[PDB]
Amino acid sequence: GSHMVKKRVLLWDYTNTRDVKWAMDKINFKGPLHSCSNWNTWYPDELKHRLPFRPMIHGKNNLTGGEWQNILKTNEEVIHFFNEPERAGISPEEAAKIWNDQVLALRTSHHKRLVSPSCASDPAGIAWIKKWMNLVAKNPPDYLGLHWYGTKGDEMIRYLESMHKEHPHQPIIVSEWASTSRSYPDVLGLTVQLANWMDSTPWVAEYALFGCMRQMADDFVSPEAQLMNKDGSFTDLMWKYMSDQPMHI
Numbered sequence: 001g002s003h004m005v006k007k008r009v010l011l012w013d014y015t016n017t018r019d020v021k022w023a024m025d026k027i028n029f030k031g032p033l034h035s036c037s038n039w040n041t042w043y044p045d046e047l048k049h050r051l052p053f054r055p056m057i058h059g060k061n062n063l064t065g066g067e068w069q070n071i072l073k074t075n076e077e078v079i080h081f082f083n084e085p086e087r088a089g090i091s092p093e094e095a096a097k098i099w100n101d102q103v104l105a106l107r108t109s110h111h112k113r114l115v116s117p118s119c120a121s122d123p124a125g126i127a128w129i130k131k132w133m134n135l136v137a138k139n140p141p142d143y144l145g146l147h148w149y150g151t152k153g154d155e156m157i158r159y160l161e162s163m164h165k166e167h168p169h170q171p172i173i174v175s176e177w178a179s180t181s182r183s184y185p186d187v188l189g190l191t192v193q194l195a196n197w198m199d200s201t202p203w204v205a206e207y208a209l210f211g212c213m214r215q216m217a218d219d220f221v222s223p224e225a226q227l228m229n230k231d232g233s234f235t236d237l238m239w240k241y242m243s244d245q246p247m248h249i
Contacts, residue, residue, distance in 0.1 A: 004245050005199040006034035009208030010051060011176065012044055016213060020232030021046040032199075032245045035206055037175065039083060041070035054115070056080040059088050063098065071106065079106055080145060080175060082117040086128035090117075096135035104139055118145030118175040121159055133167055140169055143205055147176040149220065151186060153193035164203055174198065174207035184224040188249050191225075191237060195247045209241050 010033050016023060017038070024046035027033065037054045038044050041062050047053060053076050061067060071079060081103060082088070085095055095117055106112040117132060119125030125147070133140070144167045148156045156177065164172060177194070179187035191209065198204040210217070212227035212234075227238035240247050 004032060006032045006245075007199060007204065007206045008032045008034060008195070008241060009054075009173075009175075009206050010036040010242075011208050011210055011212055012036050012038045012047070013213040013217075014038055014040060014044075015215065016228075016232070017044045017046065019214065020228075023228065023232045023234070024048075024050075026234060028242045031243045033242050035078075037080065037208060041067045043070075043074070043076075052076060052078070054078045054080055056083065057103065058083045059085075060090065063102065072110075074112075078113045078115065078142070080115040080118065080173075081141070084120055084125070084147070085117045086119055086124050092128055092131040092135055095132055099136050100139065107139075107142075113142035115143040115145040115173050115175065116141040118147055118173075121146065121148045121150075126163075130166070142170060143173045144170055145173050145175045148174065149176075149178055149180050149210075151179065151181045151190070153190040153197075156190070156194050157197055160198075160201070160204065171203050171205040173205050176208055176210050178210040178221060178225045180220060180222050180225070182222050182224055185249075187222060187224045188237060188240075191241065192247050192249055195241065199245065212238060 029050045033051060035054060036047055036051045039056050039058055041055050043053055055071055055074050055076060082090055082095055107114055119129045146163055148159055179190040181187050198207045211225045214228055214230050214232050227235055
């Protein structure tokens with residue numbers, strides 16, 4: 001408690017880049033926001049370098065050609081591997097072979113830091129990352145990527161504690177999380193709890209709250225958790241995430 005804690009990621013869906021570039025300029029760059037990701041290899045120009053950007057090798061499409069050239073040429077420091085590879089048909093054995101064969105070079109040759117694939121928090125996700133981490137143990141990632149979605153603050157905390165215990169050798173990046181509660185009071189309550197918690201957990205490197213986009217991503221996420229309105233203005237939850245440390249109700 002001597003310094004504003006800055007470990008909040010701006011998740012910047014490509015539909016923002018498509019429709020409301022101007023909303024990036026309404027971002028508070030002075031608060032606890034310290035990075036930005038967009039699930040892609042390409043850079044969102046409207047950011048204008050106002051935060052570090054983590055490119056992602058999302059899936060198999062992003063391993064060759066121009067997608068790969070975007071990764072090879074990036075001035076940014078930290079690169080994410082696959083999004084939810086267990087749900088895209090990608091085997092731990094294969095993502096292992098890809099890591100050793102092509103992604104390691106981004107460290108050993110480009111001195112980038114690399115996030116593990118970010119798996120869902122369900123048993124299929126937990127067993128995917130468990131096996132992959134085992135296979136690449138001789139060349140491990142800099143960071144363990146995790147997704148968490150649900151209604152109970154105390155449950156996300158137990159999942160992070162659990163996963164930290166199971167994969168002790170590196171810090172955690174929560175590359176996506178949110179409240180799925182439809183009660184705005186519960187959404188705010190959990191977000192506050194987990195932002196403030198993760199802020200004082202030294203082994204949590206950074207955390208990335210989902211929902212800064214004009215339309216609902218799917219039926220699983222809560223309309224009450226949205227960080228942007230349909231006109232591309234920011235919601236109060238977004239104001240607080242990007243302005244308040246500690247954050248409060």
